[PDB]
Amino acid sequence: SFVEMVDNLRGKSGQGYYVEMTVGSPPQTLNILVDTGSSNFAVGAAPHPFLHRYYQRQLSSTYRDLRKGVYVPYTQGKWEGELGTDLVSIPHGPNVTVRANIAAITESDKFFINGSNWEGILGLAYAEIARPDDSLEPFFDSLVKQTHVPNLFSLQLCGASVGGSMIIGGIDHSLYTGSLWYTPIRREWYYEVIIVRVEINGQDLKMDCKEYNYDKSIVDSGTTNLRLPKKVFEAAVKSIKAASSTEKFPDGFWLGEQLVCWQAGTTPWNIFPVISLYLMGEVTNQSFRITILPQQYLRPVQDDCYKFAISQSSTGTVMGAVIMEGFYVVFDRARKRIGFAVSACHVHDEFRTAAVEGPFVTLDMEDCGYN
């Protein structure tokens, strides 16, 4: 826990959350995107149309070239660069300084975002998915090994300019209400989890639960939307369409292409269903659920306009930012588990509320994992 880290994240809707950090000596301040969906720490190290500032190795007395190139291909985009090590600090984070690996970005493609206000990315996931390979120690591992910071961190992402908190080294009890519910981290590469059941407005989607994790399911703060496998995505859109059949929307809408609008303050929230994702518990045949409100998957962009924040995937389920926003998420690396709880900055609806509830009985949860 720590009071100094409570409101240390900012960003703008759909553009990711970022925390401030400093690299080098003397300290070079840079806004770094918080990403539990990758494992590389990378910062702009050369001009780019979208970068307001960038890491200048030359000006840091502590830089150290590792003399190795590097590139990382995300679903979204990619960047290329040169590996090295330098001293890093998080102003509004723990009170420590560590020498970590740093990918100085020299070239990028569809990575940086115009007006995002961040110039680097902090992959908080495990070594196994780090580039060039799992020998390039990710930041958090370095932090844990060099300092006493406990091997744990939590994220409180709040919707709307946007903000939230990244509690390094623990859990801050003033950021959530109710009980925390844990789901096992299936394997230490991405923050993989297993979804055992899915319901829309109470109705079980009735799909073989292997489909829910077809390929895999991960907790990705570096992705905006809720990303579902083809078969699942189709099932939901069909279910969500019917629920809101009272009104009609262009196909481009359900495809995330064109937004929809309503006379300011008249958004028909009630016609959009809640989605319940049931996760594997810590005990035998036990699980729990987190419920998302349409206020979470209908991202805001005169009138009130929104984008359908649920898109299909070819790489498994992705519990993105919009899914994390309603809750306080705990990445308990030490106990290989992820905890969920109603956030202090939860979404609102006079007649409905996002939640984390348990316990539930769910037989054969192991069969839900894909192989």
Ligand X SMILES: CCCN(CCC)C(=O)c1cc(C(N)=O)cc(C(=O)N[C@@H](Cc2cc(F)cc(F)c2)[C@H](O)CNCc2cccc(OC)c2)c1
The residue (of 136 and 342) whose beta carbon lies closer to ligand X is 136
Within 263-282, the residues that bind ligand X by CB under 6 A are none
- 35 in catalytic set: yes
Nearest to 352 by CA among 277, 310, 280, 296: 296
Report the distance separating Cα 98 and Cα 144, nearest Å.
Answer: 10
Contact stretch for ligand X (CB under 6 A) within 55-63, 75-83, 151-159, 172-180? 75-83
Nearest to 322 by CA among 231, 220, 234: 220
- 208 in catalytic set: no
Long-range contacts from 126-133, C-beta under 8 angstroms, 24+ separation? 126/39, 126/188, 126/189, 126/190, 127/39, 128/39, 128/188, 128/189, 129/38, 129/39, 129/189, 129/190, 130/39, 130/40, 131/40, 131/70, 131/71, 131/72, 132/68, 132/70
Minimum separation from the CB atom of position 311 to ligand X (A): 6
User: Cβ distance 38 to 121 under 8 Å?
Assistant: yes
Within 95-124, the residues that bind ligand X by CB under 6 A are 111, 113
Minimum separation from the CB atom of position 108 to ligand X (A): 8
Among 75, 147, 239, 286, binds ligand X (CB under 6 A): 75
Q: Which two tokens stand for residue 134?
A: 């799992």
Catalytic residue among 7, 134, 204, 220: 220
Number of residues lying near ligand X (CB under 6 A): 19
Q: Which residue type sits at 294?
A: P
Interaction between residue 74 and ligand X (CB under 6 A): yes
Catalytic residue among 35, 86, 141, 332: 35
The residue (of 14 and 170) whose beta carbon lies closer to ligand X is 14
Report the distance separating Cα 297 and Cα 70, nearest Å.
Answer: 35
Within 117-156, the residues that bind ligand X by CB under 6 A are 129
Minimum separation from the CB atom of position 223 to ligand X (A): 4
Binding mask 16-55 for ligand X (x = CB under 6 A): x----------------x-x-xx-----------------
The residue (of 87 and 338) whose beta carbon lies closer to ligand X is 338
Minimum separation from the CB atom of position 34 to ligand X (A): 9
Tell me the pairing of strands 310-313 and 226-229. Answer: parallel
Minimum separation from the CB atom of position 110 to ligand X (A): 6
The residue (of 126 and 182) whose beta carbon lies closer to ligand X is 126
Q: Please provide the size of the chain in residues.
A: 371
The residue (of 24 and 316) whose beta carbon lies closer to ligand X is 316
Nearest to 90 by CA among 125, 142, 131, 39: 142
Report the distance separating Cα 361 and Cα 302, nearest Å.
Answer: 47
- Say which DSSP state 122 is in: E
Among 86, 220, 325, 332, binds ligand X (CB under 6 A): 220
Minimum separation from the CB atom of position 309 to ligand X (A): 9
Report the distance separating Cα 236 and Cα 222, nearest Å.
Answer: 23
Nearest to 24 by CA among 79, 99, 107, 103: 99
The residue (of 69 and 77) whose beta carbon lies closer to ligand X is 77
* Residues acting as catalytic residues: 35, 220
Q: Which residues bind ligand X (CB under 6 A)?
A: 15-16, 33, 35, 37-38, 72, 74-77, 111, 113, 129, 220, 222-225
